[PDB]
Symmetry: D2
Subunit: 60 residues, 4 copies
Amino acid sequence: PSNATFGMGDRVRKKSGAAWQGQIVGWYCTNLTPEGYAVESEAHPGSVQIYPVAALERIN
Amino acid sequence: PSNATFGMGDRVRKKSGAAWQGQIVGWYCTNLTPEGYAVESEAHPGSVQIYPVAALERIN
Amino acid sequence: PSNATFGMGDRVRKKSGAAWQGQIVGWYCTNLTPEGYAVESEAHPGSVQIYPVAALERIN
Amino acid sequence: PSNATFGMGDRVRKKSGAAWQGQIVGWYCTNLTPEGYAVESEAHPGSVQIYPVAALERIN
């Protein structure tokens, strides 16, 4: 996108707290989370979790 | 999209099993769920859940 | 329990951020969340979400 | 429990569809899922997902 922090297929991980790591497979937007991503785990194929951009970092 | 079943802002609900109802706020795609949507609950603002297109119906 | 903050069937809600409200239907414990609860939404029957005790308040 | 299929600490995995594997750390019960478990991923510490007993198998 003309702006999004990450793109489809980027490899990312949660920066802290519960762990999560895998590829970007989607996106979402609400008032509470104006920039969110769906991430498919690279360890557990098919399992997807969603998070706000701030919780995530590209790897790298 | 030139194809997606639903668009941003459509009002939908889960067709069966656990209930869910609200607006489409996002989308995702994996091998297991090639067409998925993120839906923000209309009863619990800020809470989003994701589901495959087949689990959902537009209301209607 | 001889200690838990809430019991099965208590009515609670998330104190801030994304909303959630319903009845306590379960419990969990990890190093990261040593006292967690499963809560079934009172608006969307069958849908359960889990949270750490600190995120929750009894209503009341 | 005098009945539960699994106990705290059992190692289990999802039998099919999206993958998940780790240790039992909790439990839940609703009309829709009268016997459910919370499972902490062994690959992503701190991340917990909940499932009905039928979706799970002990490993084994």
